[model samples]
Target: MNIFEMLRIDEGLRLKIYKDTEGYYTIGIGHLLTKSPSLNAAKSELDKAIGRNCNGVITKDEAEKLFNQDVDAAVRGILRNAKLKPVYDSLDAVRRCVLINMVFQMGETGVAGFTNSLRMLQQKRWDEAAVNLAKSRWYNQTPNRAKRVITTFRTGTWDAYKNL
Candidate 1:
């Protein structure tokens, strides 16, 4: 089985904070807690979840790994949608990353609803695609992030696309 699917079955996905069978604070796909000195010093989201002092928390590396796995699952879901395959495959890496992020934020169904944007992407009409993205509910929900993605769609440089 795929790592993501395996994680879903083994780890048990939890979107909110919850106490596991062992009475440990955990979130996401079975991300067990532990106090790591290095992670404590870094104080990432994992640290914040456990506490400012850090009791039981996953390290940044672990968190990143889980995040990547989750995103991979979302990307897989997006790829499985036949209608989106053409547009998704046509984009470059940066654009594809933005699309995957959108799929992660909005489910495959929601991303697929962007018919106009998908068509523009398939046609290689970057400007029109960006415009269509800006007009989406996803854009309204997260304007700053949407602008960043839209800029990335228009121009292929994600680094230069600051959310102002």
Candidate 2:
């Protein structure tokens, strides 16, 4: 799985609107329905734009477009973070996606908090970077995704995403 389906594996699919773990009403591949931070207001807003009820099933294309925008913001947020730009420019393609996936899940600000890790990455100290990630509370909370991402940090491969 790549960026699109990679998120599908992380966030899973929900054609109908539903509340996320944090109680945000999301739909269509984790698209936040409450952009204005109001449940009813935001659902109403999306309903008008997507032409579907809050509980209605959205089209596959709709889900794809939302995920696309989310990933775009993720990538942009990384480069725009300034301090991350040099490290961002130094990585290979898959490693770049690795950073984007972390940012996608935890926002750029959250990932930017990994000072030691970012420095390790900048120095190409791959194993040290993975160790930095492995010790994080982020890893403790979500071990599977953390393991996959941390291993990618060390190996610089997409084997973590391989099914077989």
Candidate 3:
């Protein structure tokens, strides 16, 4: 599957607002409204994304639009962060997805904090990178997802994107 489809499976689909595992306000495939700088603007943006003041519900098409935009932000943020640029550019398609997935889950700010892991990834030390990830709070919070991502990194395969 492609990145969009892969994320749809991994993040789970939702049309209305709900509390995420971390109890943050989220909608349409894990877009975190709780992290928004301002709730008013967040609501405004949600309506805009839904194309007609959606209130609380979103269409599949509208949700897809928001998902696409969120993916754009993650990818761009991964590329924009100076520390990640080189590590990001050095990976093949399969491994790049791993990186993108992590950035999508945690945001560039959090992902960028994994300084040692980034270096391991940059050096193509997949096992080391995986170990670093397992040591993180993210791993504790989402052990299942983290394990799959870790295995993907070691195998350099997209198999984890399947059979979900």
Candidate 4:
């Protein structure tokens, strides 16, 4: 199931999707994931989630905002029911999903850079993989979020995306 479906999100649920517990923003099915609105927003709401959370560095407020959205609570339920289904064919399912979650906390272009890094994993280049991950501008901006997600990516576990 998709993120909206997994979260049991309807239009009504969309009404409740506010940022930072103080109504920074609300994301609906047809909403754009960036600062601007477009007729055809190709990005996912998950993508929007990451953008607002951290276009550059994430604040303490932004990090906690993510948790309030109940990402793990909502996602882990799906994992429990689906037995950790892989969202990507190339990487471990849960790991990939978590990576996507981290990227959502970051942005899509950042996630796209991981494409080659996933290949590095396939080639058994662990050090190189981690290095490539660290080299992203994302790492420079959000150090804490980077540290936490890198730990998860390396550990291959269901860890929280610690923004602090």
Candidate 5:
């Protein structure tokens, strides 16, 4: 089966938008429709389309397509909103992937808030960037993933977090 089916099976099919275990607004197949800056925006859009606090449903195929579209838009948002294209492009594929994932976890604005980290990245001060990354709440929330990203940021190596 495709990755969407795998995710659907793993996440379970939730027909309506509802809060997940973490209290984040989740939708079909664990799609996160609510997040910082975007939560209000999504709610606004939903209100315009339906009534307030209304539940909705989507087919599995629709959920799959929505997932792909949202990911694409988020990637573009990282490039556009974060305005770190130069620094982002300088990284190897592994590090770039990590950056994309970071943007996904923290909204574009949240990533942009890492002014020191972004500056260090742009200056190619890899060590400083890694250190700066450790100072964030994201680091506290996901220490292992943060460590992986920090190591890749410093060494530009895919193997840094592979076995760690």
Candidate 6:
């Protein structure tokens, strides 16, 4: 049920690596990183570093650090990829995450953009947001993932679902 476990790691993708004195490993790519410390003692140190600084916020150097600091950059890269940018307006974290997962996989601009969804969410029309979320070009494209996320935002149980 852990969020990280849900999102399976793709070894083929680039990841950031960080080590700690205790010998824990952490993986980062973009703005996200894995905090799991069970891989090895070195991995636990990575987890500590990631836990302290891996929420998508960074500067130019931090961005470069992403090259091998942790897997965060890869996650952020996927999330920030232009193809994943939804045209929808700003939304709550739950709603945004749901949409980002979809758009990130389906192409932000390609899938109906975020125009209508943004407005609906902005107005706080839960029902409208739910409906708009379900109608995106990517909806049926991956019904399972779409429905899961759509249901989360609609039902206010988004935290329950794991992206992986």
lDDT leader: 3
Clashing pairs in 4: 50-104, 86-93
lDDT of 3 at 135: 97
In order, how many clashes per candidate?
Answer: 2, 0, 0, 2, 0, 34
Q: Residue-wise lDDT of candidate 2 within 7-54, one digit each (tens)?
A: 787778787777775677788777777745566675686787576664
Where does candidate 1 have its weakest 10-residue lDDT segment? 1-10
Q: Which structure is stronger by lDDT: 2 or 6?
A: 2
| Candidate 5 wrongly placed segments (more than 4 Å) | 1-22, 28-30, 35-63, 160-164
Model 4 weakest 10-residue run by lDDT = 6-15
lDDT against the true structure, per candidate, is 0.65, 0.80, 0.83, 0.46, 0.65, 0.48
RMSD of 3: 2.3
Candidate ordering by lDDT (highest first) = 3, 2, 5, 1, 6, 4
Worst 10 residues of 6 by lDDT: 3-12
lDDT of 6: 0.48
Off by over 4 Å in 6: 1-6, 9-90, 159-164
* Residue range with the least summed lDDT across 10 consecutive positions in model 3: 33-42
**Tens digit of lDDT per residue, candidate 4, span 77-141?**
43443222223334665456544454344334445446667577566465677788888876786
What is the TM-score ranking, best to worst?
3, 2, 5, 1, 4, 6
Cα RMSD, each candidate:
11.2, 2.6, 2.3, 11.3, 5.8, 11.9
Instruction: Tell me the tens digit of each residue's lDDT in model 1 across 44-160.
Output: 555554445444345555555666766777878877889877888988877777777667656689888888888988898999878778886767865765776678778876453
lDDT digits (tens) for residues 17-48 of candidate 6: 54322233434422233345544544445445
Evaluated against the true structure, the overall lDDT of model 4 is: 0.46
* Tens digits of lDDT, candidate 5, 24-102: 7676555677564456665554444333444355556665666676557657887776366766777666567667666
